[PDB]
Design a protein around this ligand. Structure first.
Ligand code: W91
Ligand code: W91
Lengths: 283, 19, 178, 253, 253, 283, 19, 19
């Protein structure tokens, strides 16, 4: 286990045996792909192979090393104000839970229909000094599940978190991180959906009727400062203890908007990664 | 060094294993 | 009615017509009239709910009085029924008012998602429950002809909640003094 | 041997020629277990009277044909019994068998790609955040596309094939359970598919779990009289249908 | 003890007062046996989703009321599922449970005779050899008589009670499975009845096996405000329903 | 234990068995609620249920996960002064122990008559820079039980804490936290009371005759600085190892003042969460 | 990892257990 | 957790015991 796990030799690939010639009836190279199945032909079948003892692990080819990597999924921003502190909808951020809200990683999952996981969340606040001294800028992140009082503005009553989670980070002390159970009323997170809100010819349809999990209302606790700032707290996300069901063809068209598939670009012709050739004859 | 789930909950733990 | 107590009683009336309807409320346990209830008040402390639920009704009528209501649970899927027949088609319980007095109606758990959200959500719509007359309210001589029924809701061993969160049903648009 | 026989209701289908059969995700469709369940009522399970071999509306295979799809929970919103039980109940769960018939002669040349797809969230043809409309992802026996014309006022999906209607290079579509109908060997295509969904029983009305696509890959080519029409006929069989959450009755749309 | 509880579908009925219950011909309704059978196909047996507690349209009990009947295979020609399976199949077989509710107070006086009747060939009101019409022995939830008025052009049955509508002194009617509703003791009436017919499964459309009659014997008498209406409500439950001979679908009438 | 405790499957709910029909005498659906007891009817009783093996824990529905969550119960503030340092009643805070002093969490307990617990106290100082440089602002919190010398002003003799507790926090070093035994002369904390100080028709009556536990006199040790500041040290509180006796109906009227029940708003009609309906007939 | 009451007093300890 | 006199000298240690 150790060795196998430390040496990373858990999932090893078979070796390529030796072959000889075959002047025989059954032709393995011939199958009818219309059966929708996949061929089973190998080196040893087609050629006069040798003998190679392999030693490549398919460890890094596991839904956990494919998925289990932290990725920017949101960049909370706060261009503070000292003029009006508090006021409605200010100096505090709120953002709806999700992804589809950002490619590269969105891309990645979408490779599967259903998915399930606990996550390694990490907050990377970066304090840009627009003043001659930033002081001590404390911070409060927290989670607002449904249906819950989402701060109208900066000091509601909801920042008491008498029964909510609020993580606090003060300049110097390291990046806040933490983790989380798999939050869904369903046995898995619906990375897609072919359902609607209802029969209302104006109902919602997508990944989304099924993902009302939150939002995040933010706060820079410290009170009024002299010299201004702007905070940019980056939100990274990692999938730990993941499972996946029914793979899908990757995405080749740059999306737009989340919780939707829509590609149809604003005017520009739909572009894809495929390159053009002069002729099939020369590559 | 391992299996020392310093934290109570299971959701908090390292990347799972392989089998 | 609302700021008073009455806000709790439901008088069972005359009804010239027949097969007429009494009331309705929707099941989404965080929805006035429900919400405020020891349950509701609570559930509003968690993000998700589940299991069956129990509605109980009591006749604060008379002794010599008689009646028969039909209560029904109309699962999520359509609109709160306009008519009895339409509603009788799903889950229900005919209630014979008699020497007993309390009929308890169970609200099975029908849902797609093992779990439902406590917060208003078109998806996690639990449905409606309504009450209608089966027969009437007959009273022999010199007995009042309107009377009340109290209604209640307790949980089922089915029941269970999760994901604690801060409540809905209470905004401290204070502060609080000394 | 290629010949195949299938019996589902009071109905049976035969095929003197075939390309095996395929079981979606190598799982055979069956009834729900008191473990994964959630609901509390006793499901009604019409046997035979329901999970039988319903055949839809047929279609023409053109040299101009582009492709056509049917959404399963929906294709039988009218097919007797099953399609009533659908409307009378909130929760519905069921698996299917897809028999795709399309013959012509050994002097014909053509290729059809058939595939089923779990959660086939289509994309709108129009840029924006406006999702396809209900009423248009709910065609019925009749299916959708063909290569048809329509109002662009409708929050209309993508009639666009090569992108998979979801914007995934068709051709990677081979990842979904499938097979072809190469008129030179094949005659049909047979897909069998269990119930896939993060929930034990979904809404047969709001949610279509399986989505089926048939796409002409190599265009039909004969040298005959265009008096010779080569239809494409789809037949379906709910299997292990189970329903529950009885009540009034929804409404047609 | 008189209290009774009955559970049939997703439905249950209670009664804090009663006069026992009666099993028609002392036989409990059940499913057909491969001995007495005849058909060859596998019957569809909707369980629960079908053989459940359907309640009809209610009625008024008048001092001028004369009597009202409902014909069973027919009363639920609309009651969801059962009443669809009826129309989709040739052969139908099923037994029932009849819950007759009619309360008022202990200061009321009245008596209702309730009875079920195997093959209740009614007589026409007009002399001759003209038999009652279809369309009039096929009323539906609504039932027939009341004490109503109608076209005499219609090959109309006998609205005539005392003769039993068949011309047998009502009162010998006690031979058919029955009970009363003496408002001074009773509250309901409960009839349970197996499938009686010289054939293993009949036509749910052409033939109504059971016929139910409720007849005011001693006229309702209160001293209250005629604002006090004392309905009569009938509830029914197909039991051990079994169907077969699947196909297109008949038509409503 | 582990698994059950790590998997959080300690308190599991029963499953819903299968039923059949009942055309029988005893009617479980009929009980007389006047007995003051609660019905015992279930799914299986009322309907023709199926068979669902459950898997929901009532773990998070425990007085410890209901109560055991940190909540703002006080926000100590110090608008420093450099003009007059020391002086009487300045630059040092003092506050009486309690709650009722702040909703959301006050609300929460009040759900029970009696309560008992040890607590996880955490101090979240936030230093707002009103100057061009905050220096090194050290801090001293401490606890003044009864009857004890409560600092008259900033440097008394009581800040020697020769036998008292004073926690010290210096800008940078993390949040001060600590904990505490259940402090009451009584076997439980009286979250209510129907007693008075005495027969004096001017005696006190409430939760309060029974909660003379303290106060907190504060201090910013550092001495005189140049560039001003304002400190806001937030006081969070968590209940660990809690017990509760005799539940009560929650609160629906926004309170005012603590150690009292009084609702009667200043003029405004007494408002509650209940919503109004046009008609009972449609919901 | 657990039951390591790094501190002497009992009042100082994690959230209790369940039973 | 205890008796882990991380330091050599005895003068350095926790508050003694009770007996
Ligand atoms: C699809 C999909 C993705 C997710 C994840 C939900 C978002 O997860 C977070 C939560 Cl619940 C809280 C916080 C957070 N709370 C305070 C700061 O950040 C961050 C993330 Cl990524 O759920 N369905
Ligand atoms: C009711 C009720 C609530 C309490 C708790 C008492 C307040 O607890 C604290 C104490 Cl004793 C000291 C400190 C403290 N000392 C230095 C800084 O904070 C904070 C709290 Cl919340 O007692 N009865």
């Amino acid at each position: 286990n150790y060795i196998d796990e430390v040496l990373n030799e858990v999932l090893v690939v078979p070796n390529i045996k030796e072959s000889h010639h075959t002047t025989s009836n059954s032709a393995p190279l011939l199958d009818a792909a219309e059966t929708g199945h996949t061929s089973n032909v190998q080196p040893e079948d087609a050629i006069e192979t040798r003998y190679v003892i392999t030693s490549q692990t398919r460890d890094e080819m596991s839904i956990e090393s494919f998925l289990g990597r932290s990725g920017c999924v949101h960049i909370s921003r706060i261009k503070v104000d000292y003029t009006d502190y508090n006021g409605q909808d200010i100096n505090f951020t709120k953002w709806k839970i999700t992804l589809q809200e950002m490619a590269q990683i969105r891309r990645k999952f979408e490779l599967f229909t259903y998915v399930r996981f606990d996550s390694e969340i990490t907050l990377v606040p970066c304090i840009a000094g627009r003043g001659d001294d930033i002081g001590h800028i404390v911070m409060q992140y927290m989670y607002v599940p449904p249906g819950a009082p989402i701060p109208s503005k900066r000091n509601d009553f909801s920042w008491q978190s008498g029964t909510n989670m609020s993580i606090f980070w003060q300049h110097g002390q390291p990046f806040p991180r933490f983790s989380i159970p798999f939050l869904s009323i369903a046995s898995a997170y619906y990375m897609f959906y072919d359902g609607y809100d209802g029969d209302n010819t104006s109902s919602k349809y997508g990944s989304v009727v099924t993902n009302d999990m939150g939002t995040i209302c933010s706060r820079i606790v410290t009170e009024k400062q002299k010299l201004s700032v702007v905070i940019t707290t980056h939100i990274y996300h990692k999938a730990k203890h993941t499972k996946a069901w029914c793979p899908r063809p990757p995405r080749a068209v740059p999306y737009t908007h989340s919780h939707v598939t829509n590609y149809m670009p604003e005017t520009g012709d739909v572009t894809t990664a495929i390159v053009r050739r002069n002729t099939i004859t020369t590559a | 060094y391992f299996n020392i789930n310093y934290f109570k909950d299971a959701a908090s733990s390292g990347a799972s294993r392989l089998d | 009615n609302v700021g008073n107590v009455s806000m709790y009683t439901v008088q069972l009336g005359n009804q010239t017509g027949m097969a007429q309807k009494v009331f309705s409320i929707k099941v989404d346990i965080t929805s006035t009239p429900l919400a405020t209830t020891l349950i509701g008040e609570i559930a509003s402390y968690y993000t998700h709910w589940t299991g069956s639920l129990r509605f109980s009704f009591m006749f604060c009528g008379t002794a010599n009085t008689t009646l028969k209501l039909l209560l029904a649970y109309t699962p999520p899927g359509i609109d709160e029924p306009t008519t009895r027949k339409d509603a009788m088609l799903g889950t229900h319980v005919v209630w014979d008012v008699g020497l007993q007095s309390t009929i308890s109606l169970v609200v099975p758990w029908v849902s797609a998602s093992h779990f439902r959200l406590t917060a208003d959500n078109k998806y996690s719509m639990a449905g409606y429950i309504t009450c209608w007359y089966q027969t009437n309210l007959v009273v022999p001589p010199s007995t009042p002809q309107t009377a009340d029924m109290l209604c209640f809701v307790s949980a089922c061993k089915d029941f269970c909640l999760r994901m604690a969160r801060d409540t809905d049903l209470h905004i401290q648009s204070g502060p609080i003094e000394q | 041997d290629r010949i195949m026989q299938i019996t589902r209701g009071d109905s049976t289908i035969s095929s003197d020629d075939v390309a095996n059969a395929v079981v979606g995700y190598g799982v055979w469709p069956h009834y729900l277990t008191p473990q994964d369940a959630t609901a509390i009522n006793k499901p009604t399970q019409p046997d035979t009277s329901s999970n039988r071999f319903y055949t839809l509306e047929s279609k023409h295979w053109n040299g101009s044909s582009k492709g056509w799809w049917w959404k399963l929970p929906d294709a039988l919103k009218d097919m007797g019994i099953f399609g009533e039980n659908m409307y009378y109940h909130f929760l519905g769960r069921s698996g299917y068998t897809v028999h795709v018939q399309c013959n012509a002669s050994k002097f014909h040349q053509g290729t059809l790609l058939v595939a089923m797809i779990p959660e086939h969230q289509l994309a709108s043809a129009k840029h924006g955040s406006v999702t396809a409309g209900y009423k248009l992802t709910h065609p019925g026996e009749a299916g959708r596309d063909v290569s048809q014309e329509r109002d662009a006022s409708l929050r209309q999906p993508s009639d666009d094939s090569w992108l998979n209607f979801d914007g995934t290079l068709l051709g990677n579509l081979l990842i979904f359970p499938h097979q072809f109908i190469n008129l030179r060997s094949n005659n049909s295509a047979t897909l069998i598919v269990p119930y896939v969904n993060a929930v034990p029983m979904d809404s047969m009305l709001r949610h279509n779990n399986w989505c089926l696509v048939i796409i002409p890959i190599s265009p039909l080519r004969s040298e005959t009289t265009s008096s010779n029409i080569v239809p494409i006929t789809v037949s379906i069989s709910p299997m292990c249908a189970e329903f529950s959450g009885a009540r009034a009755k929804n409404i047609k749309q």
